[PDB]
Amino acid sequence: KEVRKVRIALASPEKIRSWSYGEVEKPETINYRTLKPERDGLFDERIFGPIKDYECACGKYKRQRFEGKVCERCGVEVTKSIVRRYRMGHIELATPAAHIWFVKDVPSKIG
Amino acid sequence: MEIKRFGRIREVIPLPPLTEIQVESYRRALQADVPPEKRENVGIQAAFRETFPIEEGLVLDFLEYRLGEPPFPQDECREKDLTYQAPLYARLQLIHKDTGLIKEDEVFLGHIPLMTEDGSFIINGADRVIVSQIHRSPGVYFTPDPARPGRYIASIIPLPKRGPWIDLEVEPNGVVSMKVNKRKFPLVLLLRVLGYDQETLARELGAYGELVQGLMDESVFAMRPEEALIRLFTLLRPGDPPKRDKAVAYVYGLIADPRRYDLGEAGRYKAEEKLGIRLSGRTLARFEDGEFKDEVFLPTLRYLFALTAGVPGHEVDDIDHLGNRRIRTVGELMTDQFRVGLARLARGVRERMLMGSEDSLTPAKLVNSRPLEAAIREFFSRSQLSQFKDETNPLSSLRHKRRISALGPGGLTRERAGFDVRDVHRTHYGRICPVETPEGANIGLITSLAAYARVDELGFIRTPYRRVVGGVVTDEVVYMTATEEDRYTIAQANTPLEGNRIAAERVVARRKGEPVIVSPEEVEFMDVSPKQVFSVNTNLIPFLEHDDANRALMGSNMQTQAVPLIRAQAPVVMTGLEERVVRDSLAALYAEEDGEVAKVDGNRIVVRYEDGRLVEYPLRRFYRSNQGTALDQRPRVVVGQRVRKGDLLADGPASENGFLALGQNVLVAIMPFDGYNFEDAIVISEELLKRDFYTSIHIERYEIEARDTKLGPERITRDIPHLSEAALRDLDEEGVVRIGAEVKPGDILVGRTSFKGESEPTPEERLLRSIFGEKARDVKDTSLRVPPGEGGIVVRTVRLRRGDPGVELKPGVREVVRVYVAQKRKLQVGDKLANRHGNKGVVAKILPVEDMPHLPDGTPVDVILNPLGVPSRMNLGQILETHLGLAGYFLGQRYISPIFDGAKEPEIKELLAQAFEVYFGKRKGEGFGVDKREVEVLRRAEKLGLVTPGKTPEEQLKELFLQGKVVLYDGRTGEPIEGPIVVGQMFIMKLYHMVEDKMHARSTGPYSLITQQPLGGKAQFGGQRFGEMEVWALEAYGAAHTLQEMLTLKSDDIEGRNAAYEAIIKGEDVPEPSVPESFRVLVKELQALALDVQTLDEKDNPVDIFEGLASK
Amino acid sequence: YRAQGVKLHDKHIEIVVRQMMKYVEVTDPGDSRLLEGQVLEKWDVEALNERLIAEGKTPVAWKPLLMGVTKSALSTKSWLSAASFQNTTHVLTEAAIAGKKDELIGLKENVILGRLIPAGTGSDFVRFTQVVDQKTLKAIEEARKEA
Amino acid sequence: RVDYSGRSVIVVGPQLKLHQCGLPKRMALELFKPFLLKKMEEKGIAPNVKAARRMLERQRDIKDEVWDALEEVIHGKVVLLNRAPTLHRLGIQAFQPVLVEGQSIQLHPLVCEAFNADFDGDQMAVHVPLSSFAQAEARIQMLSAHNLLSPASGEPLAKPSRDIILGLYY
Amino acid sequence: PVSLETYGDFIPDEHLPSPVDAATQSLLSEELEKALSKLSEREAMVLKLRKGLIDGREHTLEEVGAFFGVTRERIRQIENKALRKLKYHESRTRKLRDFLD
Amino acid sequence: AEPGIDKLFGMVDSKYRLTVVVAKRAQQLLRHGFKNTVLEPEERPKMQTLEGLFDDPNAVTWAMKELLTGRLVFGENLVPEDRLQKEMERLYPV
Amino acid sequence: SDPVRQYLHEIGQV
Amino acid sequence: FNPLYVMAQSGARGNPQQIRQLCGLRGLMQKPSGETFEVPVRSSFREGLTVLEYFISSHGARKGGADTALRTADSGYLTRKLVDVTHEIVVREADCGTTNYISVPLFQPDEVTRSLRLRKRADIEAGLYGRVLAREVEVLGVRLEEGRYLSMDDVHLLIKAAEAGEIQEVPVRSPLTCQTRYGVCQKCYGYDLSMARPVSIGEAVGIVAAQSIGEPGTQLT
RNA sequence: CUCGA
DNA sequence: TATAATGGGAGCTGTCACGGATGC
DNA sequence: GCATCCGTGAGTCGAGGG
Ligand SMILES: [Mg+2]
Ligand SMILES: [Zn+2]
Ligand SMILES: [Zn+2]
């Protein structure tokens, strides 16, 4: 189809969780010695997708013949690595937090 | 050749050392030649004095310090990319109050960068310059309230980051307030804290009508200083518990503490002069005998109430006045960052004293040098006033050190600076040059110090003047501040003088900058020279009085952009300052004492002096400067030559026989040529490239690193996968290009092989592997090649290996290779030429010698300038330079014509007459009469009124020559130009802007990580940015597909650009563009803001632009 | 402009001034859902007024409202055009709250998305034009004629 | 920032027709590089595309036959010349390029007013329209010779000035 | 690590293929099919299955042998003769040499 | 300036309609290898080469010249888009 | 306004 | 035939004020405060200026450059504003069919307020040339029809009839009165000033208008 | 930030 | 893993004009 | 109704340089 319109609105937490491919639990980036994504971290491949095209973390499925297949061992989907610019993560807060734009933008929308 | 000099003005004093504003300041701060007991309280010595003692072991105290010798010399530092610096040792002692135990040790605080002889620094191998800063001098000021006419504002200003500004205002309700850290409170409250009583304030401040009743508050006098102090503390510190000892500590620090609040030494003097009082310390008040004692507060409030009431003797202040503005030199700017870095070390000391054993501690254990090193390292690296040195020519370096900036840390932010700071103040005279300053947004912010100008110990700029007593001008010279100058009447430097006495009964003088005509009796002082009004570069412009200031600005600013030429010549017409500049810039080599030269060599000069000692001067040859120009010294003397003290030995870069040479002296003809010189463009003779005029040597440094990786180490080797002998031809055994080899774009400088990344061979690669039956090699070709549009001959190779003596690299790095590739640049089309008068343009055409307009004797002109450039620009100096240059051509003599005193027209007419006799008179002796073509032009001239009718052909030709015009023949025809053309010698330079460096093109290339759009820059081989204003252009034309091309296929569309390049190479039309990637980034970056961006169709049904990739 | 010797056609200025008058303020709702003091476009209020008049209802009483270019630019219907200009935060928030939809009417909207600008060669007027030679034109005409 | 673009210092040619501009060879070789490869395969200058690209990578490997191929490439096509700042639409104009020796771009005198470009060291950027559409938009609409008048006034934007006026007046 | 905003405009993208490389892989995939078309439908298919140009993975001699039905000894020499016929077609035409880097 | 450009701006009701017409026709020629040209052999635009005159590689150049002859028909909704494509592919194989 | 000061105050309550 | 005079007259280079400084006096100059110095430089660049005279002049030169510097920043801002407000404006149709127009006056009230006098030629051409008449105009025995695009000669004719007291104002189709949505029509906008012919539909006048206003923004002193 | 326009 | 210690330090500010909430 | 604090703007492209 052709895009005739662009709409912007508010995202519900459920909507936010729908975009999410996983929750990032650990405030970690990459392994220090191996320079690879840390599990449940910000760079984790289990969430945001594979680093190399059509190849998993452990290397069990290395080819395009497996597509949409999620590896059992490393839990990493086999697909194009370009999705790392796409798939959203999410962080679930213990207590609700206000969106600062709807607070400090005068007059306040929440106020 | 003989050099004739004009002007009747005799300079009483020569120019002061020009780099002294750098050298003397940094020497004043270091005091390295001064024994530790004789050091004053100024400089880095002060920093130790402010920081120490450090209490709460208990007491860590400072004794003295010292500076060791540099670990590496200047040249070696530039080689290894180290910093030229000296180690800093400080003797400290730990003292326990209770125990009485004293442990003394000398601790190493790190290294402090050292200034070179010429006034610059070397930081990490790169020469840098600390630019002096200008700001508002500390003190007490009074300015009219913009909102309330008749009412004034008292402002007490300390040094930068020395503590807060304070404003004393008389409120509409009548009370006198005070502003500290943006807080309004009654001043009376603080006055009580100082111990003042209504008894004292009534007698002192009562004399001024009804300003004293706003100062009267009974509730304030109803409480003792201890109560009012806590009252003030609650006002300035909400939420903080009003403890008595915490209240004293705040106010003491905010007001009485010299360790925190410090007025300038000038700020002290300024406050004393203005308020008519005397300051014991540099603070606003003191803590003495358990209480606070007022210093600056009462006399300030006294001055305000007097100014407001209209009491005479009280005037407002001009903040732009050079008496109220000072200069922060390299010494003061470094001291502050040394002062901060020392206080950071103190915070680590008190923190160390709380931890560890209270018994065993040494000054070595307490002191961490890291916070001190960092503060210094940042100031010589990332500071704004620390700039990359301009080495392009010796004048560039000299000017760069003489710069003044109103910007930088503690200075004015850009949005703050209006007209006032930028404007030339009447007090700039003799101090700050009205001419030199950048074009554009930087105008008035960055200036240059005047030639004779001097920065005193208080930071202000002083200018020299001559004492005039009873109409007699003495040789006594008095440097005055901007304030001191206003007290006298100072006559101009060109004032007529018979002997030492004033000749004229009416002289031109200034009173507070205001020009006035007075008598010799009324003249207190006289200007030393016309040279004192202008900067160094502006003083290099001959006939400056005939040039408009706007173009003189360019002529001045473009001299520093001049590229040193191998053949470079001194100007035929000079200002006489060409010798001093070369000397003070340390470009040329000179003789230290009288003696005989023992040896003369290209690399070396050995001199035997009167002492009998043999001194060997090594010569710098073909050294690469910062900008890439070649810096070399050529010996000017011969073996056995008898030389005196201060005599030239070797000519530095851009220098001829001890004179400053920024360019060539060429014979110019001013006339339009076939639209080739249209709009400032220039047409040059091919004869310039034949004799190598305007040819310069340029060097370009290339660097590469071999490092240890997790896939295995990279290495420099001659073994490069998939390369023939043709590619490896000039590489040595180790894989480095040999010395003296010609390199072209695409050629390999240093061979390098890195292990390939982890590689899953694609089905196309595996099948292709088996077909040719060749195993894929482990490494790949990373080798450093020559960047497109660059090249030359390699003159040097430097290699640093790990595991080799004296060599330690950064972690992970095996070896670092540096290849130096020089070049010889001939003048070409697109190179920029300019003169000293502001005339500038690129060369649009190079004509063969036979097409050039020529003289009757057959001599072709060099440069053809367009006369249309003159009238609108209003710079006539180049015209006078040319006329006098014409005479110098046939008389074989140069000229010294100082600014504002120089050759008048009649004096040049006399020379032109003598030139004619050599030019024309030679012809009549050669047995040749007048040419037919000359008569035709003469007939035209008679109609033009350039010649008097009836005179012989010779007499009329002379009349034209006196006007500097000659008969010119077109080379293409042989027919004469229909009128006489102005032709003569002009001094023209080649600027650093050249078409070789500036040309760039890209088809496809590297793209940025996120945006996925082409990188910026030439070195990165990037594409040209198409901006908002350029998009508007395509829109205004209405070309959609040209615009949609720029937004998709040519930049960020990954599917689009890949499909486009494949389409062209297959001879297919380009495909329809898809969604630009940067828009997807916008969508995703908005999702992180919890905003849902939905692309919808006409049916309002969402359309996925990510094609199911981001959707679960 | 005349003072500085710059010849400029009045109509250019008129284009801009027209955009300054683009908005109006309601002096009374009448039968509409509009509020007193509410600001909207002069086009949309007359489009509602002609609908209410055709419905026999009471038309909205409005006032002419002048605003500078900066305010008129931020007051535009397209949120992509507004946020691309300035006060991005203030723009996006109100746009997200109202669940605003951009019809991509203007140039700037399409420039961002990388679409074809509704001007010149991309204008709907001239973009559907077809080119055919007489040999091809007659070849198709015979296929139509036989059917 | 876009691909197929370059820049250099501008120099006035007298000899250019109003619709022409001097474009340096070394720039045009790079700008038209994908087209140059295709033309090289159509002739005997190279077996294939990749072999032709490797040929141009090294300067000493560039022979005379490739330039004559480049001339065939740019024939009839126009580039886009632009100078910053762009105040109005004439800050970008379409020109049929003419290969020249030297690193400098050549500009026609009469369009200098619209660009507000002098010869004092101004530079200009080059842009190459790819599609047959973008070349059709440029040639018809954006051609210098196709806009003789100012959209702001309607008085001629390209007119004799400087030396041309001085010569005519003489 | 150091911040990108200190500098991120000077950093190239080494991951995604440039249009040069993208077109190079595209011209390689096409030229390989031009060479494999000069073989029989079998020996071209065996070579595609052996190097994994079909399903993406390289099959053993038993799997390609069981697919076509022939013994592993047979299917290995069908691969050889297909590789040998490609070596002769390559030396003659010299089309695939440039891609060997 | 483009030859006869004044005449071309007279054929159209908008300067832009001309460009769309010229661009589309230039695409038809490229796709069909110039077999569909309405130009007579003497009207063929020529490019002077090292050897001699050869056909002009520029599709837009031809399109403008074809348009000057009046042998081309422009307008909206003359023929269905997909039907127009294959009638040319039948007459002039690509 | 200042998180630290606000905390030090809530600490001063007990 | 004097070179300076020729270039001045021909319009090749220079203006009378610039020529005066090369020949006559340099003139009066400004103090940094905007105040004017009572003593003007009596010198010309031909003669040369003293060191004091040169210094008095640099006050203005500095003020001038700094003015231009800070001006271009504000002009650039205005230009971007105009674009953003006018960007959606493009000519979408031939005629919106409006009955509304504006009346372009050929006469302006004198400063003496004595009577009405004819406007300057340049000013009339600015609001007339390239515009469509919304009503029939009969002047000097000539018929200018409703819907006519006024040529340059049509304007000069209207000026003549005004001098004859026949027509004091000209009805004109204007973008102010244009009822087209999301832009203007062809008739209201009038000529495309580049081609001196009626504007081609699809032309974006908004960007063109914004650019036209913005361009001589650095020229306004 | 410093330069070029 | 156990002497007992219980409220932070940072702070140079030379522009203008706009809307709009905030207060007298 | 009217002073005052807060947030928001304040020219383009291209070199070099840390
Ligand atoms: Mg210029
Ligand atoms: Zn796995
Ligand atoms: Zn209309």
Swiss-Prot record, chain B:
NCBIfam families hit by this protein: PRK00405.1 (NF001616), rpoB (TIGR02013)
Enzyme kind, highest EC tier: transferase
GO molecular function, one term: DNA binding
UniProt-listed Enzyme Commission number(s): 2.7.7.6
Annotated GO biological process: DNA-templated transcription
Catalysed transformations (reactions): RNA(n) + a ribonucleoside 5'-triphosphate = RNA(n+1) + diphosphate
Record InterPro entries: DNA-dir_RNA_pol_bsu_ext_1_sf (IPR042107), DNA-dir_RNA_pol_bsu_external_1 (IPR019462), DNA-dir_RNA_pol_su2 (IPR015712), DNA-dir_RNAP_su2_dom (IPR007120), DNA-dir_RNAP_su2_hyb_sf (IPR037033), RNA_pol_bsu_bac (IPR010243), RNA_pol_bsu_CS (IPR007121), RNA_pol_bsu_protrusion (IPR007644)
Protein name (Swiss-Prot/TrEMBL): DNA-directed RNA polymerase subunit beta
Organism listed in the record: Thermus thermophilus (strain ATCC 27634 / DSM 579 / HB8)
Annotated Gene Ontology cellular component terms: DNA-directed RNA polymerase complex
UniProtKB/Swiss-Prot annotation, chain C:
Gene name as annotated: rpoC
Top-rank taxon: Bacteria
Record family assignment: Belongs to the RNA polymerase beta' chain family.
Organism encoding this protein: Thermus thermophilus (strain ATCC 27634 / DSM 579 / HB8)
Function per UniProt: DNA-dependent RNA polymerase catalyzes the transcription of DNA into RNA using the four ribonucleoside triphosphates as substrates.
Oligomeric form and interacting partners: The RNAP catalytic core consists of 2 alpha, 1 beta, 1 beta' and 1 omega subunit. When a sigma factor is associated with the core the holoenzyme is formed, which can initiate transcription.
Range within the parent protein: 1356 to 1502 of 1524
Protein name per its UniProtKB record: DNA-directed RNA polymerase subunit beta'
Curated annotation (Swiss-Prot), chain F:
E.C. designation(s): 2.7.7.6
SUPFAM superfamilies: RPB6/omega subunit-like
Molecular function in Gene Ontology: DNA binding; DNA-directed RNA polymerase activity
One record GO biological process: DNA-templated transcription
GO CC entries: DNA-directed RNA polymerase complex
Keyword Nucleotidyltransferase belongs to the record: yes
UniProt keyword terms in alphabetical order: DNA-directed RNA polymerase, Nucleotidyltransferase, Transcription, Transferase
Gene3D superfamilies: 3.90.940.10
Catalytic activity: RNA(n) + a ribonucleoside 5'-triphosphate = RNA(n+1) + diphosphate
InterPro entries according to UniProt: DNA-dir_RNA_pol_omega, Pol_omega/Rpo6/RPB6, RPB6/omega-like_sf
Function, as annotated: Promotes RNA polymerase assembly. Latches the N- and C-terminal regions of the beta' subunit thereby facilitating its interaction with the beta and alpha subunits.
Description of how the protein assembles with itself and partners: The RNAP catalytic core consists of 2 alpha, 1 beta, 1 beta' and 1 omega subunit. When a sigma factor is associated with the core the holoenzyme is formed, which can initiate transcription.
HAMAP family: RNApol_bact_RpoZ
Protein family according to the UniProt entry: Belongs to the RNA polymerase subunit omega family.
Protein's name according to its UniProt entry: DNA-directed RNA polymerase subunit omega
Native organism: Thermus thermophilus (strain ATCC 27634 / DSM 579 / HB8)
Gene: rpoZ
